[model samples]
Target: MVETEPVQGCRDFPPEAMRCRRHLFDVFHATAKTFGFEEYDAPVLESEELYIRKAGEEITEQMFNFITKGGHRVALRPEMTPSLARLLLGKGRSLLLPAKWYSIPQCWRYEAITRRREHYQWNMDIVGVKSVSAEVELVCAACWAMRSLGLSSKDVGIKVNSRKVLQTVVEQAGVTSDKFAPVCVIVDKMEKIPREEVEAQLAVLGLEPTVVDAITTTLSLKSIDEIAQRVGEEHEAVKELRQFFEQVEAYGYGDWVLFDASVVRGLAYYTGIVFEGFDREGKFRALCGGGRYDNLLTTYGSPTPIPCAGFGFGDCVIVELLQEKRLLPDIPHVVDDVVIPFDESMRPHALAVLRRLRDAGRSADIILDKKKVVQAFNYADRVGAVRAVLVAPEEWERGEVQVKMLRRGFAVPLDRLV
Candidate 1:
């Protein structure tokens, strides 16, 4: 059987839905631009190998990929970082340094086509700078972006952590470098998966029971200073994260961003700081996630690491939040002026006057069927139009028009139409 509605896990944005999306996009764009992040984007389709490079099994298993008529394997992009890497590498050394970039990319993941989740992300990344300042700025922009969308610290919060910080605990537990990656992935799932399953997986990786205990204990610590104080501060992760906290607090988003040991982003490529923005009440899934990917571009053929960090703010979760709070934007019906001709004979005059209004920078248009003046006024009121410009033969003879304010019977001359 074939389903005739929109493809599963996809969206068909009708007028109202599209208007809401556009309104949100306006806010996202304005917020990013205020932070001086120039927008960038790439095609939604990419070579399957692009995603396969460092994508985990969970990602690859759901890939919407196929062999094209040309025999090339391609997939709908599930994430934007690889395409970003490819673009950055293609530019090579000729490109300027310390770039602030943003994108809202629609991506597809392999999943059952039904009731779905997630959406295009407002992804902002600062490349070529390795400093806590970059992360601080990124987090601040995220906080403001949420605030702009009518969410506050009470509505959502950012949980901060660093992979570098967590690895220190793993190494201290005697988990070899080869085993550390898998351990981190399992630990990242601590909130969703059972503790016993994670423990079983750790033991399966050849970790002794005590070592597993030592590593999981890191998730209990409150701060980097605490981690360094307890576990020999020589680890680079501790020092780096302490600086991150200091800067984030200094910026006054202290209430919006907090340290969480459990926030290790599930992706394995994240080599430094990580964070996830989830509903403060923990009612829904995470709204966004990202971190410092110092080594990501290197995998795409950059000769050395690019110190980078950013986050992706999804449209769907935020929409859910706004609807939950009844904070949806009050977007009125948009038709501005309805040019109502007095009769069929006066349509030319009405049409001309309508174009005149539009040319003068008003949102003006004529009703398709010519109507009596009273009928036109009724239609104008029905469509929520701001004014009804009457195209009567007398007004046309006078070389001026009578504009009726939909509010009442007040009709002003041409000069006062606005």
Candidate 2:
């Protein structure tokens, strides 16, 4: 017999689990709409070349890529930003400035040692706006989604930083521009790995002891005041960071965000203002992360650089955190109405009633088989239907149907039902 189980590291969402996922996605979609971000989508499979240049990123290294039967190298997308950039580039001169787009796409990675290989990630991106305001809006959108999900600043916090902060420090220490991405890949491991191990990785990158020392000191400095002292208040990074916080505060999400110089995200494209949302209880990994990539579109062949800021909120860690916090809603499958025919002779009328109920935008189902009226009502209750509609010959002649409001037992006119 063939294996009954799904592929290793894959997941199967039965009805109950699907309801929970739908609940989460509803919030994602609602939050995006509330924030004025238009919905968009791309293929789950994309050319492998789209992910190749980000050399040290986990997303790139763990790509689920392969050659197709036709010899085209393609992969399940590990992230959405590159695909979004490709779409923007495809639109070219016709694309509007300051486009806000959002999508919930299932991203895949080739990792079997731990976390599931596939997850639906909610991506919210703002393209074409410059200045730190874009970062502010994106960060606040993340906060809004969490808050809408029953999380609060007390339960979660977003650690914010800017790669430009470290870029200046690394540049001052004579690390070439080409080496910066690899350096960041190493630095991001500080919380997960030992300090000496991280330092050792940097040394492997040819960074001298003094440069490493400066990097360590800069990352450790806790406040924007300290950062201003190191990079000067007039420094572009420092100023932009200040503006980022100020805007988030004006948006009234100040408590949800904080300055953390160590939060440089693992992605190589991040040019400034990086942030990661974490559970304040410290029980799970980062709930989400994002940053500014003013250069990403240019790297994808846009002659002029496009400024973009966005975040990827994965379906896994946040779900885990919500479960641990007892915030995940236990949503049961439910229907708004169940239509029942009194006898075989009434099935035709029942079918029409089902159509009318559906056309009226009600979640409805009908007894597809011959069953007793009492039996149909029992089935309706089993399915948690709000109302059981009875379409009988007498009711049809009276231009009405009996609605057992499992919550109403009244004769509702067809017009009233509408």
Q: For model 2, what is the error of residue 344's alpha carbon versus the real structure, in angstroms, after optimal superposition?
A: 1.1
Where is model 1 poorest over a 10-residue stretch in terms of lDDT? 52-61
lDDT string for model 1 (141-189, tens) is 8888889878888888888888886676677666767676666677877
Please give, for residues 1-418, the per-residue lDDT of candidate 2 as tens digits.
9998998889998898999999899999999999999999999999998888754777788899989999999999989988999899999999998899999999998976966889999999999999889888898999899999899999999999989989998898888899998888889989999999998888988888999999999999999999998989989998898888888988999999999988988989989889999988778889999999989888888898888999999999989888888998687668999999989999888898899889989999999888998899999988999989889898799899998776547898988886
Reference-based lDDT, each prediction: 0.79, 0.90
TM-score of each: 0.93, 0.94
Clashing pairs in 2: 405-408
List residue ranges in candidate 2 displaced over 4 A. Answer: 112-114, 392-400, 408-418
Candidate with the greatest TM-score versus the true structure: 2
TM-score (C-alpha, index-matched) for candidate 2: 0.94
Q: How far is candidate 1 from the true structure (C-alpha RMSD, Å)?
A: 2.3
Please report how far candidate 1 places residue 329 from its true position, in Å: 4.5
Off by over 4 Å in 1: 1-4, 53-57
Number of colliding residue pairs in each model: 1, 1
